[PDB]
Amino acid sequence: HHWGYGKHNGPEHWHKDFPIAKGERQSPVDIDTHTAKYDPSLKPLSVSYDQATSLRILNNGHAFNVEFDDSQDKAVLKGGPLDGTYRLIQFHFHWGSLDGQGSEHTVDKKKYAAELHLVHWNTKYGDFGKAVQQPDGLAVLGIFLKVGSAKPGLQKVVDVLDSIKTKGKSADFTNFDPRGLLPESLDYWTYPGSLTTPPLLECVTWIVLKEPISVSSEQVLKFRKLNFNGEGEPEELMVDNWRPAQPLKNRQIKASFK
Numbered sequence: 712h713h714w715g716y717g718k719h720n721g722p723e724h725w726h727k728d729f730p731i732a733k734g735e736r737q738s739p740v741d742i743d744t745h746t747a748k749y750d751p752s753l754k755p756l757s758v759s760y761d762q763a764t765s766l767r768i769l770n771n772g773h774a775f776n777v778e779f780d781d782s783q784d785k786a787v788l789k790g791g792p793l794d795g796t797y798r799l800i801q802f803h804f805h806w807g808s809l810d811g812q813g814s815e816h817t818v819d820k821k822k823y824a825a826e827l828h829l830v831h832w833n834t835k836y837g838d839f840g841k842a843v844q845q846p847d848g849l850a851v852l853g854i855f856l857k858v859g860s861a862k863p864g865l866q867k868v869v870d871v872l873d874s875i876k877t878k879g880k881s882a883d884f885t886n887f888d889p890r891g892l893l894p895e896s897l898d899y900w901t902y903p904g905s906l907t908t909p910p911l912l913e914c915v916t917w918i919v920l921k922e923p924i925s926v927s928s929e930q931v932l933k934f935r936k937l938n939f940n941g942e943g944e945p946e947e948l949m950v951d952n953w954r955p956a957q958p959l960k961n962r963q964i965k966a967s968f969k
């Protein structure tokens with residue numbers, strides 16, 4: 712009886728195995744655009760993905776993860792609110808059963824169709840497993856997806872999803888360039904939060920881009936054909952794998968832009 716997104720094991724239940732679910736810096740949150748503070752001392756984000764080395768794609772039973780070689784500074788995030796260098800380890804998405812929901816963060820209570828999380832860890836902690844134990848261990852770059860025009864840089868991901876339909880399936884996924892998933896602007900909101908799935912560790916500096924990317928109806932429909940279950944288990948579509956907005960508590964969301 713492990714956590715998930717169903718009636719009996721979904722976000723309202725998590726606190727029973729993961730009591731930090733009710734903690735002081737949980738994610739996601741609503742981004743109230745009118746009460747976010749412009750911080751004119753925030754640095755431009757530096758996204759350095761030219762040397763990114765993607766390895767594989769995995770259906771872990773909660774989402775699909777595109778994994779990268781994080782054994783050297785190949786794909787890094789710097790600047791913005793961050794001190795030091797964070798390495799890209801993986802990206803994944805959260806999405807809805809319907810275009811009117813699927814994002815974890817909301818903007819003035821608006822839900823997008825999906826949300827992309829590019830997960831990075833602070834190199835001063837040596838590996839991802841150490842980093843998640845530290846209050847400054849991770850930087851997650853969050854990008855909203857709306858349904859409209861296709862995103863061409865997403866299509867390689869959409870086309871491989873047939874090979875990882877079920878929990879535990881993996882496929883080789885080399886030479887994927889995550890720069891093809893970024894919007895034009897790197898204007899952002901930032902706040903201190905958590906992982907949005909168990910174990911809900913309060914180790915994340917969230918960086919949420921103002922500008923969504925547009926994906927096609929056919930691209931998000933292909934996400935909804937995935938399964939939460941393993942092969943040979945009853946079929947349950949992988950949809951609505953999002954945690955709702957949590958209380959902001961004693962936090963201020965800062966903006967890089969006026």
Ligand SMILES: NS(=O)(=O)c1ccc(NC(=S)N[C@@H]2CCN(c3cccc([N+](=O)[O-])n3)C2)cc1
Nearest residue numbers: 828830840841843844851905906907908909910
């Ligand atoms: N949606 S999200 O972007 O907030 C986001 C959510 C979940 C993860 N977790 C990933 S990719 N791997 C898991 C999470 C933490 N983890 C554990 C668990 C307990 C202890 C340790 N350890 O060794 O210190 N490691 C391995 C990344 C990102």
Ligand SMILES: [Zn+2]
Nearest residue numbers: 803805828907
């Ligand atoms: Zn996520």
